[PDB]
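Field reference: "sequence" (input) and "structure" (output). Example, pyrogenic exotoxin B zymogen:
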Amino acid sequence: LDKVNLGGELSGSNMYVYNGFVIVSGDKRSPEILGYSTSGSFDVNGKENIASFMESYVEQIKENKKLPVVKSLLDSKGIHYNQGNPYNLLTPVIEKVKPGEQSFVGQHAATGSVATATAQIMKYHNYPNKGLKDYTYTLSSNNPYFNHPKNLFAAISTRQYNWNNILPTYSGRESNVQKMAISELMADVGISVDMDYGPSSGSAGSSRVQRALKENFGYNQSVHQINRGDFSKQDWEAQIDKELSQNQPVYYQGVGKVGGHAFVIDGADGRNFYHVNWGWGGVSDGFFRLDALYQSAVVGIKP
């Protein structure tokens, strides 16, 4: 084992990670093994959606101080998307340098975890074939990366998505046919969720995702947002288990000051660990506990 120096907000001793990989807490008033995997490694540098989740474990363990098997559905189809090239080839191009930050002018903004999570689930279903409704929104007045005013628009009602061209994953030297297909999908999805574009891109998430999947992309009326706080632990996990039992990956997110920090839950080991795809090409994917004890999910995702 080779420990990772989490640093940042995970630079304490309340949790330790060693590269597969393993995650163990540092206080027996909380579960011992938090997350694990037999392949790849774990990292959170520059990956805010993974770090946000980890930061919740820490808050959880500190709170403890006061005291079916489903094979990864995405892996089964070889779905591994990311947030940068070529997935973001059609997101807005950064125009301004944010005071005090290094310049990203000329680069396409990140797709956003919310859009990457949503796109992977859509690819799993290879749906829809035809977009249903257009979408527009105005970029946040406080966004320091673009000139204002800025209105974004996606002609989704005119889309005929070719799922043979939208590949399950991208290597790098794919032709325009394939790169255009995935970048168009990512740009449409991001716009449908009012993405606040930047070197990192944020969206409110769940509330936007459930509405976009039905209104813009034609998914089943069964699609809806569920909040963790409205369910008992048993009912919550039973919801997730039912989705997975029906071959329906789940959109999941935690909340930060910049919006939803999303990922996809697409499997279960049977020991209460759920398989997670962080949308970063594969790094850090594995089995995690929903908690180590403002989370939400979008379920009922199917055509």
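Helices lie at 48-63, 113-125, 176-192, 206-215, 233-245.
The first strand starts at residue 15 and ends at 18.
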